[PDB]
């Protein structure tokens, strides 16, 4: 779920780029405090926002998660990543939700769209809006 103060691009950056600690339990507190629930699984890509914007310039392909959508783009190269998995729920005290961490080196597929006219910076006309698949 996206909180209202974020554009889709800003929420993508928060969930998948800005890993605020190398430890999943700490990093996940940010996502979970914003969306008011402990997310069951989440991938952080060890790459830059600018690098993902450049992936939006690669050829269009069908999104693995939706046969009807053609706004997806393959990374071309692999990147390091960290996958976080919920081990310990706590729906009445989100702070005490714990995670495992799994490091890997994989390709990724992102969905991209035109930026939010009012709120996204003009610097980037085309932005990532969803992490569709890791492969």
From Swiss-Prot:
Q: Give each disulfide bond as a residue pair.
A: 24-84, 38-97, 56-112, 63-72
Q: Where in the cell is it found?
A: Lysosome; Cytoplasmic granule
Q: What's the PTM story here?
A: A particular signal processing and glycosylation pattern may differentiate the UpI2 RNase, found specifically in pregnant women urine, from other nonsecretory RNases.
This protein's GO cellular component annotations are: azurophil granule lumen; extracellular exosome; extracellular region; extracellular space
* Stretches of the chain forming a coiled coil according to its record: none
Q: Which UniProt keywords apply?
A: Chemotaxis, Disulfide bond, Endonuclease, Glycoprotein, Hydrolase, Lyase, Lysosome, Nitration, Nuclease, Signal
Active site positions, chain numbering: 16 (proton acceptor), 130 (proton donor)
Write out the tissue specificity statement of the associated record. Answer: Liver, lung, spleen, leukocytes and body fluids.
Reactions it catalyzes:
an [RNA] containing cytidine + H2O = an [RNA]-3'-cytidine-3'-phosphate + a 5'-hydroxy-ribonucleotide-3'-[RNA]; an [RNA] containing uridine + H2O = an [RNA]-3'-uridine-3'-phosphate + a 5'-hydroxy-ribonucleotide-3'-[RNA]
Which residues get glycosylated? 8, 18, 60, 66, 85, 93
For molecular function, the Gene Ontology terms on record are: lyase activity; nucleic acid binding; ribonuclease A activity; RNA nuclease activity
GO BP term, example = defense response to virus
Binding site residues for substrate: 39-43
Q: What is its EC number?
A: 4.6.1.18
Give the modified residues of type 3'-nitrotyrosine: 34
Q: How does it assemble?
A: Interacts with and forms a tight 1:1 complex with RNH1. Dimerization of two such complexes may occur.
Entry remark concerning the domains of this protein? The N-terminal region is necessary for mediating chemotactic activity.
Similarity annotation: Belongs to the pancreatic ribonuclease family.
**What is this protein's function?**
This is a non-secretory ribonuclease. It is a pyrimidine specific nuclease with a slight preference for U. Cytotoxin and helminthotoxin. Selectively chemotactic for dendritic cells. Possesses a wide variety of biological activities.
- Protein name (database record): Non-secretory ribonuclease
Q: Which organism is it from?
A: Homo sapiens
- Underlying gene: RNASE2
Portion of the parent chain present: 27 to 161 of 161
């Amino acid at each position: 779920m996206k909180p209202p103060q974020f554009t889709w691009a800003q929420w993508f950056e928060t969930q998948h780029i800005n890993m605020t600690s190398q430890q999943c339990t700490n990093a996940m507190q940010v996502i979970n405090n914003y969306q008011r629930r402990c997310k069951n699984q989440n991938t952080f890509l060890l790459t830059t926002f600018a690098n993902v914007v450049n992936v939006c310039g690669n050829p269009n392909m069908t999104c693995p998660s939706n046969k009807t959508r053609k706004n997806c783009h393959h990374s071309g190269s692999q990147v390091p990543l960290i996958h976080c998995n919920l081990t310990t729920p706590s729906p009445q005290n989100i702070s005490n939700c714990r995670y495992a961490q799994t490091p890997a080196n994989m390709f990724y597929i992102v969905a991209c769209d035109n930026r939010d006219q009012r709120r996204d910076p003009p610097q980037y006309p085309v932005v990532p809006v969803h992490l569709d698949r890791i492969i």
